[PDB]
Design a protein around this ligand. Sequence first.
Ligand SMILES: CO/C1=C\C(C)=C\[C@@H](C)[C@@H](O)[C@H](C)C/C(C)=C/C=C/[C@H](OC)[C@@H]([C@@H](C)[C@@H](O)[C@H](C)[C@@]2(O)C[C@@H](O)[C@H](C)[C@@H](C(C)C)O2)OC1=O
Lengths: 159, 49, 71, 198, 346, 147, 69
Amino acid sequence: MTELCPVYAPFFGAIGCASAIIFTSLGAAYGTAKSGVGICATCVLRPDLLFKNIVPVIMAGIIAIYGLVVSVLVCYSLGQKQALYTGFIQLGAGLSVGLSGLAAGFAIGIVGDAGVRGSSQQPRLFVGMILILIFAEVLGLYGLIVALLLNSRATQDVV
Amino acid sequence: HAQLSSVLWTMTIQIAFGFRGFVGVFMTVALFAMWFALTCAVLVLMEGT
Amino acid sequence: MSSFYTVVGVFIVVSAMSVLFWIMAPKNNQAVWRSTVILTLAMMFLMWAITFLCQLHPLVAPRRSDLRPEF
Amino acid sequence: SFSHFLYYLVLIVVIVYGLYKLFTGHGSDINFGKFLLRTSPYMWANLGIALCVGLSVVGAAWGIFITGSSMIGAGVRAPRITTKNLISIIFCEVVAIYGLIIAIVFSSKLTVATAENMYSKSNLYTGYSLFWAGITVGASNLICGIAVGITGATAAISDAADSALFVKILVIEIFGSILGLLGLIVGLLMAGKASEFQ
Amino acid sequence: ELYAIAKELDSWFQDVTREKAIFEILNKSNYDTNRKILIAEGWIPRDELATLQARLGEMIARLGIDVPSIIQVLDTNHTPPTFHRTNKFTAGFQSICDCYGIAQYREINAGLPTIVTFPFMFAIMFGDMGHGFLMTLAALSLVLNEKKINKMKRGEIFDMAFTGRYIILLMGVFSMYTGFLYNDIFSKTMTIFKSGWKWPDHWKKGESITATSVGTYPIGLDWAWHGTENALLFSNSYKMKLSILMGFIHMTYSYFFSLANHLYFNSMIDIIGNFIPGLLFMQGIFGYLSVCIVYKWAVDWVKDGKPAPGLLNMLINMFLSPGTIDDELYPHQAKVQVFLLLMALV
Amino acid sequence: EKEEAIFRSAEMALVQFYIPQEISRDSAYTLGQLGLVQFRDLNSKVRAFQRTFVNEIRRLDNVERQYRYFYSLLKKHDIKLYEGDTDKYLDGSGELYVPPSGSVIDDYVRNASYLEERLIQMEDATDQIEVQKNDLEQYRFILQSGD
Amino acid sequence: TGKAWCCTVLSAFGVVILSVIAHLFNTNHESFVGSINDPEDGPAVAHTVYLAALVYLVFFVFCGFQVYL
Ligand SMILES: CO/C1=C\C(C)=C\[C@@H](C)[C@@H](O)[C@H](C)C/C(C)=C/C=C/[C@H](OC)[C@@H]([C@@H](C)[C@@H](O)[C@H](C)[C@@]2(O)C[C@@H](O)[C@H](C)[C@@H](C(C)C)O2)OC1=O
């Protein structure tokens, strides 16, 4: 009930922890769905590439790891009597990682679908597909990094 | 990489330390197996990719 | 304790080793040996020196509360 | 359309509420000034940082998939273009780099402030500056990433036909990246005078 | 009939493919109708020219047919092919450096510095002595057993990561080294040496305690930084400045290869117009940043009493407000900063 | 001594071969066995199907097509293909082997053509027998249905 | 026999890593029992991880014998 620690302060931390996994899971699901459509489309013609072309689905799932990591780390500083500064730090970290992971998952899904459909026809395109998928995943990595930077300040000098 | 490694250690092996007894030993074995699998899957292989 | 002169001495030792290897590098794959070993030593020293300078006179001291009073 | 009906209903409700407050003599009760003064500047700062990095990443991913789809599509017949058009993906990810840098710079200003000086002039200015500079950097990086992705898709499709097209569309792509660079410059300029919360 | 074919089809196919390849190569010859001479031009390295002459002499002796001078070296203005002799160790790195593009004739090879830089940048990003050890073991399994894997057939994912088995070995070794420099063994820390941080003599449980400096950690990050609240505030700055410094060094090393190329090709105008201006630009705008990063580490700001100058704010003010410095890193800072800005703008 | 061309590309000299047609096939064999010559396209000015050895390349392309058809027959009528002796040609290095004669290639071409004729005749006979047997099997099944 | 090799490798890595962890617990290492969040009883966790490493050693020797035959 303190001016520095309102009763609605835990709402921001809880909702940031929820969002960190919600948006990353949404992006990972979009990536997994699009890459699965691509893989199932290509495996009818080139079944030998079934296990090589699953990489987009794998890289879509790493976004979910980033969201889970941020959600786990946010719960560390969650509490009833936490400051509004800590709550908004948690919300900012959760929003950063969630939106970054959502964008990364969308990009991974689209580029992975394109790459799996274009690598069966041209095997030289697997390297390009992997490169662009890494470029899409490093965006979720950057969101993770910003979330970690915010979290490092969550419970420092807080009273 | 450092944060994922630390969080994986926290969620996989650090949990097994609290448990003791036969159930503690079984949980330690299973959790170490899961930790090693996740390591060699995402951190060594994929985060190393 | 130590100062930047420790990094200077390590740099002197690394440079001496690099020059010696350049002089005595084997004839077979001479360029490969020279480049690989010298550049490995160079970036190994560079990363170690950066890590050392970061902890020479740090502006941040390790702050924690979980440490048990026994330790 | 359900969305259009919702927007119209929201507009009608807002207008009716405003007219009801104004006519009854309580028009000043809809006070945006008190909303901005009584809102914690930590909210503005954290929302600005989060939206900066999020929208920068959204624009980077937007340009990345627009360029990558075209690169893979045109690479089926000309696989040689992927390595040469990777510069387009680099120009799409540099906006995410810009957003990350701006987020680091702004997070360097996230200091715990005392209760008495919670809503001081400097603290409120810092909150507003961080929020709006983060919004500016994020939206500019989003726009620049979309433009650079479109330009890179055109460049990949055109240099699949003839490699001489890439060296002339790279100029347009650099023009696009200049927008993100200017967005970063302006975002730094806004928060240059914004001191840490105290 | 088909089983009779199966015992000899492969040899017939190989013979027919060779017979078609030799005629496809002979198809690219300026035959003289009046004479009976097929004129063909090829790109053989100067090193094996004597070997080719000896082999053609051996062929002539085998056939016994007397012929005039069959080998005549030519000096033309064409672009010779780019051929680098690779071992089993440098083959993967050169495959990496040729996937991007093929170098010019007698151009500074990018595959020689890659051998070390690429695994070391991967190690900086990776940085783990336990995961690096796993990578080293995975690569050594291929390296020691490389004869058997060479003998046997390999898949697309197995041919890859085996042609680059030495790549993975170097990345694993360098990852182990960096993990030692990070003191990160399976996300834990090694207390090998004595920490430079001393905790207070006595404190209550749950009380925030700040360590006091006693020395410096010999090798790697201090292990007293493990689990502390401000561990991130130190490690992030350390790694950001490490990235900046090791990127500036790698960039200047790569840029000096442009000078090497220009010197080899006798392009002095290139040196004057693209190397020196760019070198001054990067050593005034970004080389200065690296020098300031190194210098700020070598100055005891608390002991000296001067405030710690924010290097990022200094870099921002170097362009957005010339001549204004909030914190003095070194004497005559503003003069040097405006001089370097003028150097870049010139 | 061979230059260790790792820092820069290997020094190259453009070499001209004055090969008479009397030993042209053997010279091409030796140059391909060496594997050290990247031949220039001296005859690029003329368009296709007009070059010096277009007919003899077409003949071997036809033989390769026939061998691919034989491989397709071996795959459809499941049969493991016996791999050839890679060590016979050394499949690399600068060593020279005794190359096949022109008469050997002519025998390969004539045998491939005649045996393709035999195989297509036998395959047509087998296909017609199989299709009529399949029709009779379907007729048997429809007669075997319940009342 | 791929499962046997995978289990052999995993169990050998278990015998190494868990034995190291239990030794560090038994010696009351700062990185393992040096925080209030970390387990208070060192020797108890050391014994538990000793038993886990013995289980992994049994698995390792069984799978190595299976691989050898
Ligand atoms: C069922 O658990 C599997 C994946 C899950 C659920 C992972 C979660 C932790 C996920 O939430 C995380 C987020 C993503 C992750 C950690 C993926 C790693 C997958 C494994 O990869 C090592 C494959 C891998 C064994 C398998 O996919 C293939 C057989 C393959 O081995 C075929 C190879 O040809 C190919 C080279 C290789 C490459 C693509 C990695 O994959 O295990 C699985 O399926």
